Every structure is written in C-alpha cells, then in structure tokens.
C-alpha cells in the first residue's frame, strides 16, 4: 500500500514536465472515474464494521483507483447484521437523550482533503454499531 500512497503523494505538485503523459492519463481516467465511484459505494463499510480493508487496482501514474472486489454477503447473515444494527440504533435513539447529527458538508470548502497516513492511520478507529449479543 505504501507504493500506491507514494504515487498519490507525488501527484500533488503536478508542475514538472514529466507529468505530461501522466496528466493525459488523468483526463483519460474521467471516463473510468464513475465506475470507481460505484466500486466505492458497493464496498461501503457497514455500521457493524470499523474499516473494511479492500482490494483495489491503482494506475501506475495514480490516475484512477478502482476498488477491485465486490461485496458479497450471505443473505441471512446480511439481514441479521442489519437487523442487529436496527435494534441497536433503536436502543441508542431511545436511551440517548440528545442525538447530534453530523455537519454537512463535514469539511470547509477551503480545506484540502486529509491524507490517510498522517491523520487517520495513526489514530485507532472507534467502536462500531454492535448490539450486545448475550
């Protein structure tokens, strides 16, 4: 993953001559951009899991980043996992006296999007929506 991450970090300047064909790749990757959006939003991490370590193809120039695998889940396990989150969110709407919804959009327009390795990878994630199974 560090090779991918270094490629994405080297394409933040994009002012040398060497990026020219790489910049061609960026304008070519837009007609393969929205497919990758589906490949994010299929593999979107569910509320019972913290973070879903997913396979992904990256272009050599880091132009487009296609999340590779498809999310297959067992059907009774899938509806049981979502029903567990259903009952857990019912409990934590009832027992919670004040629910704070997110801000939208969560960041400012002036703020660049954050790097994963300097702000998220070194913070351990929180506890997901899990019903206490007896």
């Amino acid at each position: 993953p560090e090779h991918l991450r270094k490629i994405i970090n080297t394409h933040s300047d994009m002012a040398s001559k060497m990026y020219n064909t790489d910049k061609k790749a960026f304008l070519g990757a837009l007609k393969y951009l929205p497919h990758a959006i589906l490949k994010l939003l299929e593999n979107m991490p569910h509320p019972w899991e913290q973070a879903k370590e997913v396979k992904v193809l990256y272009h050599t120039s880091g132009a487009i980043t296609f999340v590779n695998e498809t999310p297959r889940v067992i059907e009774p396990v899938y509806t049981a996992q979502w029903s567990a989150t259903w009952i857990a969110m019912r409990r934590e709407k009832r027992d919670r006296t004040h629910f704070k919804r997110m801000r939208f959009p969560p960041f400012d327009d002036d703020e660049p999007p954050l790097s994963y390795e300097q702000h998220i990878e070194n913070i351990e994630p929180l506890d997901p929506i899990n019903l206490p199974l007896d």
């Binding site: 993953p1 991450r5 990878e121």
Partner: peptide, 12 residues
C-alpha cells in the same frame, strides 16, 4: 499499468 493492492476503504 494497473496494479493490485490491498488498502483501507477510507484511504481508497
């Protein structure tokens, strides 16, 4: 040109 790897979903 494309290469296979395994990263976090949030990083993707």
């Amino acid at each position: 040109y494309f290469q296979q790897t395994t990263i976090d979903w949030v990083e993707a």
